[PDB]
Amino acid sequence: LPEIVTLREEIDRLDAEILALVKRRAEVSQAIGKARMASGGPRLDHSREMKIIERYSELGPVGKDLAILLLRLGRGPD
Amino acid sequence: LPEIVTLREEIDRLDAEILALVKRRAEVSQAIGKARMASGGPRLDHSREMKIIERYSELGPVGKDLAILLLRLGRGPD
């Protein structure tokens, strides 16, 4: 379709930004993981993680799955 | 942990931006879906969608799943 060329541009721009933000979030999450590890004790703040998941549910059920994936991106490289 | 207070702030800020970007992407994707529907013919550009998925694999295997979820967010509300 010729009339979707500019919509596709916008997608590509959005994806560039999403990827940068997700990468940064993975770095921050991993730093939080390293501080929690270093301190012994729970590897997650479960109440905190559940609240994040509930925020993402504003998007629908796919929103919960997104938060779940972002949670997995916070793991140490394994 | 007291030393993770500012890291948690950064997460919250990143999540605010991720959610706004994902919502916008869902709007654009749905507009592309509506143009494709209106035109009859394939509901997806499969080569295009596969290229998006491959870009997201730069993140790892979780990256492919992310692209997959974003693809589902582009559906008409159902």
Author numbering:
A (entry chain D), B (entry chain D): 11 to 88
What does the paper say about this structure?
To elucidate the structural basis for the boost in catalytic activity, we solved the crystal structure of the top variant N-s4.15 to 1.5 Å resolution. In N-s4.15, this loop adopts a similar conformation as in EcCM, *MtCM, and MtDS-complexed MtCM that is distinct from the loop conformation in free MtCM. The activated loop is highly kinked, either because of Pro52 in the evolved variant or induced by binding to MtDS. Asp55 ensures the return to the helical conformation at the C-terminal side of the H1-H2 loop by N-capping helix H2. Interestingly, the Asp55 side chain of N-s4.15 engages in a hydrogen bond with Arg18 from the other protomer across the active site, a catalytic residue that aligns well with the corresponding active conformation in the MtDS complex. The crystal structure of N-s4.15 shows that Pro87 introduced another kink, resulting in reorientation of the C terminus. However, in the variant N-s4.15, the C-terminal residues are less well-ordered compared with MtDS-activated WT MtCM (average B-factors of Pro87 and Asp88 are >100 Å2), and beyond residue 88, hardly any electron density is visible, suggesting that the C terminus is flexible in solution. Whereas the guanidinium group of Arg46 in the evolved N-s4.15 is still not in an ideal position but is pulled toward the newly introduced acidic residue Asp55, it is more similar to that of MtDS-activated MtCM compared with native uncomplexed MtCM. Overall, most active site residues of N-s4.15 adopt conformations resembling the ones observed in the MtDS-activated WT MtCM. The crystal structure of N-s4.15 implies that its improved activity is due to a combination of pre-positioning active site residues for efficient substrate and transition state binding, tighter packing of the active site, and an overall stabilization of the fold, as reflected by the increase in the enzyme's melting temperature.
